[PDB]
């Protein structure tokens, strides 16, 4: 019974597309960063974030708040203001922190990027808080921009991105998009608790740290998908 959480409210062709982006990632992310919307918002965030010294200061700014979440993909749970605050309030360093007892590990993510809980007024003065977030909002936009077209692709890039972060079968099922890129690559509906075990023996969780083996893995995925989904 893992503490509940605000659920979303507000032919080879796939491998092809993926590869296209993944390759010249620099030009993609760079082109995106130029999009009028990403630009304007990215600007405001780069100039205001360093001024936030407290969770209050943070919550009190909708613009920055919406930015931080969209970048952590929790853009549809933004309405859970009371939830986002608690997650931040307890931080994500302590094993017992509220966010660490959740199942969707993307809350801990946010709390790691904005550690007012562990850093205090210093939290806003790190790479993870400014450069870090600014960069994910970019990847985020770029990904959902592709997903609008080929969801399989979106999953592709998202996995290539959140690849290393995984170190346990648990870390895997810990993200709908990540588990999805597995339940498909091994064609599967599985809702049991020890699926993780099945994964750790059905694959070496220690190898997914290799920016090489990772690709070949997706290789099977991007094509496994182009079939299960035309």
**Letter string b/e over residues 143-152, b meaning 16 or more CB atoms within 10 A of that residue's CB:** beebbeebbb
Residue 23 within any structural domain of the chain = yes
Residue 1 within any structural domain of the chain = no
In which domain, by residue range, is 36 found? 10-230
Residue 5 within any structural domain of the chain = no
CATH number, residue 116? 1.10.3700.10
**Letter string b/e over residues 28-50, b meaning 16 or more CB atoms within 10 A of that residue's CB:** bbeebbeeeebeebbeebeeebe
* 3-state SS assignment for residue 32: helix
**Which residues have CB under 8 Å from 101's CB, separation 6+?**
2, 3
Q: Are 160 and 25 in contact (CB under 8 A)?
A: no
The rounded distance, in Å, linking the Cα atoms of 149 and 168 is 31
Residue-wise DSSP of 102-167: SSSTHHHHHHHHT-HHHHGGGTTSSTIIIIIHHHHHHHHHHHHHHHTT-HHHHHHHHHHHHSTT--
Token pair belonging to 205: 């969780």
Residue 149 within any structural domain of the chain = yes
Please give the distance of CA 125 from its chain centroid, rounded to a whole number. Answer: 22
Would you say the C-alpha torsion 181, 187, 188, 194 has a positive or negative sign? negative
Residue that is written with structure tokens 């605050």 in the block: 85
Report the domain count for the chain.
1
Q: Which experimental technique did the depositors report for determining this structure?
A: X-ray
Please give the distance of CA 93 from its chain centroid, rounded to a whole number. Answer: 18
Would you say the C-alpha torsion 198, 204, 210, 215 has a positive or negative sign? negative
Please calculate the CA angle 141-13-221 and round it to the nearest 5 degrees: 75
Residue 2 within any structural domain of the chain = no
Resolution in A: 2.4
Residue 117 within any structural domain of the chain = yes
The rounded distance, in Å, linking the Cα atoms of 70 and 75 is 4
Q: Are 106 and 4 in contact (CB under 8 A)?
A: no
Which 8-state DSSP code applies to residue 51? G
Residue 52 within any structural domain of the chain = yes
Residue 108 within any structural domain of the chain = yes
Q: Are 143 and 158 in contact (CB under 8 A)?
A: yes
Element (H, E) at 26: helix 25-32
């Amino acid at each position: 019974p893992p503490s509940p959480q605000p659920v979303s409210h507000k032919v080879t062709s796939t491998y092809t597309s993926y590869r296209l982006i993944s390759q010249d990632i620099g030009k993609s992310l760079e082109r995106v960063s130029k999009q009028p919307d990403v630009a304007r918002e990215t600007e405001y965030y780069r100039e205001k974030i360093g001024s936030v010294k407290s969770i209050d200061d943070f919550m009190a700014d909708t613009r920055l708040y919406n930015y931080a979440l969209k970048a952590h993909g929790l853009e549809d749970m933004a309405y859970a203001k009371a939830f986002i605050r608690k997650v931040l309030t307890e931080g994500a360093s302590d094993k017992n922190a509220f966010a660490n007892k959740l199942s969707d590990n993307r809350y801990a993510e946010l709390a790691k990027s904005l550690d007012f809980a562990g850093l205090g007024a210093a939290a806003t003065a790190t790479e993870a808080a400014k450069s870090g977030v600014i960069g994910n909002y970019a990847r985020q936009t770029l990904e959902q921009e592709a997903g609008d077209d080929n969801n399989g692709v979106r999953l592709a890039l998202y996995f290539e991105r959140k690849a290393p972060t995984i170190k346990s079968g648990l870390d895997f099922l810990a993200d709908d998009a990540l588990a999805q890129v597995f339940r498909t690559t091994f064609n599967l509906a599985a809702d049991v608790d020890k699926q993780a075990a099945l994964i750790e023996k059905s694959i070496n969780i220690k190898d997914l740290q290799d920016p090489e083996k990772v690709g070949k893995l997706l290789e099977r995925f991007t094509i496994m998908w182009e079939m299960q989904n035309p």
